[PDB]
UniProtKB/Swiss-Prot annotation, chain A:
Protein name per Swiss-Prot or TrEMBL: Papain-like protease nsp3
Record-annotated Ubiquitin-like domain positions: 331-386
Quaternary structure, from the entry: May form homohexamers. Interacts with N protein.
Reactions listed under catalytic activity: Thiol-dependent hydrolysis of ester, thioester, amide, peptide and isopeptide bonds formed by the C-terminal Gly of ubiquitin (a 76-residue protein attached to proteins as an intracellular targeting signal)
Resulting phenotype, V395A: Partial loss of ISG15 cleavage in vitro
Means of activity regulation: Inhibited in vitro by GRL-0617.
The organism's place on the tree of life at top rank: Viruses
Subcellular location: Host endoplasmic reticulum membrane
Organism whose genome encodes this protein: Severe acute respiratory syndrome coronavirus 2 (2019-nCoV)
Domain Macro: 1-125, 133-260
Domain DPUP: 262-327
Substitution effect: T404A: Partial loss of ubiquitin cleavage in vitro; no effect on ISG15 cleavage in vitro
Effect of C440A: Unable to remove host IFIH1 (MDA5) ISGylation
LRR repeats: 446-468
Length: 482, 297
């Protein structure tokens, strides 16, 4: 018997003075049970400790049962049996598995209904009202059928699975196999392999029945476990999942662990794990008005759940709007130098989200094109040059220099500006260069050119070589590199 | 302005503080971050007055790496500084020794003397380390001695050193560069210990071995597994065991050398349950993990 009362603990004790409590394997009280008997000595719970995972301790009017938490591992019917270990009588208790244990309200109510004892229920401090729709268990087929029969749930079965159908007939003798719904102890639904998984899911959604079923597609259609989990998540009605392999049950649980909470609480937990968001600082502390959210500067944000809304400076902002606003904090900015006469003082500030060309236009750096390149950290403090586009000028430059590169001029100018910084002394009438930026092979090529017969087709290149042999090697080297 | 007299002893710290009070550096900005173990982390932003000076022997890189400070809760907290828009930062502390070389710092000053009488010397660099004591000049490339006065040069700096916050099944902790990837993560929560990345397993709470049968080509191994279960006829269910790398069976045999801390609760390869063997046989060091894995089954 299950009944919820609005009376206080002492008033409810008039109906029955017996109390039912929940403890761990070491006898430590769970928060609800701890608050229930906080004024009574609890050493008798740990007196017989350590226990197996699932046990019962009784003394006087106090009764306790050992239950684990879903963080380590747990199931519904195992909890029901652990509570069934308690002798049948009238007790006052909260919903089992609430709070840190992770069991939902519906699971706790079903467990209490399965128990033969009569329970008087008080509200829990931390209630898991949100329902875990998908739950995987290691119970075999017979236990699945018993659970479905006791909870009056429906189990869809594929007729092509000969072993499972044979086992069902062995347990529930006399049942016929055909495309229809059969009610004999447990509720059954049979179908052929021709029915697709999506059609079966749509039919189950239309029926709106609570289910205890194998992972759809994994056993009936040969799909992998992840696909079966995704299909079950597409299913709306709650269901209980079980397979012959406990390792598959653990894999399904691991699949269910990701993206388990609601999107607002999942986002809050993601921020807590990151400890920040772009430039905000997460606190996660509780106040009398609300729980704290991420903080930037001297202003903090606070949120209240169900519905999860955020408060800032007396204003309420929805979860979606706040998330969208936080996502727009990808503003990476850098400060770079720009010039025309190359000796003046001029500075530009650019954002790293877009490329150099998208914001300004044709830009080059030391012969490297940066028009279609997004900056990084090392680009801070660099110097850049910008030149407009003119196809006629490029055609004339090609006619003069016999080169078809449309980006030749910008790279050439950028390289020339850097090379002008260098010094070119001479040794024995031959140009020498101080080592910088791996100029050894360039100097070797210069030495080779200084000693050989040499002519060029472009007159500009010939004049540049003439100047280089006279000491103006910077322009010639820049042209060669370009 | 210092409101002192002729021949009166003075502190460089207070003199520089007064100078900066009468100086004009309001545009300077400095942001610091403080990380505590359990309680929480905070961000500190300072203006030009606070940016220029700090109490400590920390250098620029030492301040970047982090500092150790006591928290209000009694635990130890870590504080680091990555932010700067200012020409210089000054560091000072109670007397201590230091070692410096040319190019590793801007300038420093030396103080050696008692509480009622002391001498001050300064170190500066043009080509190498230069020290001046009134009318005396000292030149060297390296130096080491008791020095507590630090001046550093910077234009602007910012990097991506950030703290990380995590929860361990009931407890929230904040650390700098923690090894959380070794744990198993459920949605936004980590588990107790650190295994290799694998599917977790769950043992039966206070339940028996379920009285199921093991079948394998290695009849001795199957019988050992059955003895682990306390098998008694009839069998509730039957499973078949295959040895690595043969994964076609219901259960997979794994050598004990692949043991991980989480395997004390349960072990898994793929979605199937696994068992442990040594020399194609069971032993106590595998008997206990096999007992726990069967409890999972």
């Amino acid at each position: 018997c299950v009944e919820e009362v609005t009376t206080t603990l002492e008033e409810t004790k008039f109906l029955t003075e017996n109390l039912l409590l929940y403890i761990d394997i070491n006898g430590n009280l769970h928060p609800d049970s701890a608050t229930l008997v906080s004024d009574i000595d609890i050493t008798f719970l740990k007196k017989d400790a350590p226990y197996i995972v699932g046990d019962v301790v009784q003394e006087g009017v106090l009764t306790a049962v050992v239950i684990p938490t879903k963080k380590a591992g747990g199931t519904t019917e195992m909890l029901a049996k652990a509570l069934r270990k308690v002798p049948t009588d009238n007790y006052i208790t909260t919903y089992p598995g609430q709070g840190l244990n992770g069991y939902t309200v519906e699971e706790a109510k079903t467990v209490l209904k399965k128990c033969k004892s009569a329970f008087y229920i008080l509200p829990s401090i931390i209630s898991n009202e949100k329902q875990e729709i998908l739950g995987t268990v290691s119970w075999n087929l017979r236990e699945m059928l018993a659970h479905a029969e006791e909870t009056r749930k429906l189990m869809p079965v594929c007729v092509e699975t000969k072993a499972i159908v044979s086992t069902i007939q062995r347990k529930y003798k006399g049942i016929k196999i055909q495309e229809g719904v059969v009610d004999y102890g447990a509720r059954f639904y049979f179908y052929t392999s021709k029915t697709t998984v999506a059609s079966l899911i749509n039919t189950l959604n239309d029926l709106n029945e609570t289910l205890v079923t194998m992972p759809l597609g994994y056993v009936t259609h040969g799909l992998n476990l992840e696909e079966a989990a995704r299909y079950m998540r597409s299913l709306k009605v709650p269901a209980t999942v079980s397979v012959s392999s406990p390792d598959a049950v653990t894999a399904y649980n691991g699949y269910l662990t990701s993206s388990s909470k609601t999107p607002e609480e999942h986002f809050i937990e993601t921020i807590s794990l990151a400890g920040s968001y772009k430039d905000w600082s997460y606190s996660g502390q509780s106040t009398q008005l609300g729980i704290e959210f991420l903080k930037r500067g001297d202003k903090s944000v606070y949120y209240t759940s169900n519905p999860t809304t955020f408060h800032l400076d007396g204003e309420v902002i929805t979860f979606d709007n706040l998330k969208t606003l936080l996502s727009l904090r990808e503003v990476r900015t850098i400060k770079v130098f720009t010039t025309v006469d190359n000796i003046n003082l001029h500075t530009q500030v650019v954002d790293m989200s877009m490329t150099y060309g998208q914001q300004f236009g044709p830009t080059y750096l030391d012969g490297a094109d940066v028009t279609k390149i997004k900056p990084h950290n090392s680009h801070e403090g660099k110097t850049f040059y910008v030149l407009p586009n003119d196809d006629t000028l490029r055609v004339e430059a090609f006619e003069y220099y016999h080169t078809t590169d449309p980006s030749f001029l910008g790279r050439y100018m950028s390289a020339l500006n850097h090379t002008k910084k260098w010094k070119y002394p001479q040794v024995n009438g031959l140009t020498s260069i101080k080592w910088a930026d791996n100029n050894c092979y360039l100097a070797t090529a210069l030495l080779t050119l200084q000693q050989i017969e040499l002519k060029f087709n472009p007159p500009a290149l010939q004049d540049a070589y003439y100047r280089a042999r006279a000491g103006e090697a910077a322009n010639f080297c820049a042209l060669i590199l370009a | 302005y210092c409101n002192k007299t002729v021949g009166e002893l003075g502190d460089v710290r207070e003199t520089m503080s007064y100078l900066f009070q009468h100086a004009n550096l309001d545009s300077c900005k400095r942001v610091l971050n403080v990380v505590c173990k359990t309680c929480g982390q905070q961000q500190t932003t300072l203006k030009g007055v606070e940016a220029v000076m700090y109490m400590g022997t920390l250098s620029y890189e030492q301040f970047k790496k982090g500092v150790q400070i006591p928290c209000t809760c009694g635990k130890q907290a870590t504080k680091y500084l990555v932010q700067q828009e200012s020409p210089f930062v000054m560091m000072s502390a109670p007397p201590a020794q230091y070692e410096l070389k040319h190019g590793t710092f801007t300038c420093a000053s030396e103080y050696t003397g008692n509480y009622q009488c002391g001498h001050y010397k300064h170190i500066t660099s043009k080509e190498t380390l230069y020290c001046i004591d009134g009318a005396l000049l000292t030149k060297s490339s390296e130096y080491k001695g008791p020095i507590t006065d630090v001046f550093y040069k910077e234009n602007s700096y910012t990097t991506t050193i950030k703290p990380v916050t995590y929860k361990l099944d009931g407890v929230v902790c904040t650390e700098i560069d923690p090894k959380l990837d070794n744990y198993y993560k459920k949605d936004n929560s980590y588990f107790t210990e650190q295994p290799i990345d694998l599917v977790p397993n769950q043992p039966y709470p206070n339940a028996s071995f379920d009285n199921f049968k093991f079948v394998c080509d290695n009849i001795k191994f199957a019988d050992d597994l059955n003895q682990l279960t306390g098998y008694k006829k009839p069998a509730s269910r039957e499973l078949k065991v295959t040895f690595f790398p043969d994964l076609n069976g219901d259960v997979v045999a794994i050598d004990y050398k692949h043991y991980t801390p989480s395997f004390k609760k349960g072990a898994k390869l793929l979605h199937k349950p696994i068992v442990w063997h040594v020399n194609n046989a069971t032993n106590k060091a595998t008997y206990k993990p096999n007992t726990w894995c069967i409890r999972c089954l």
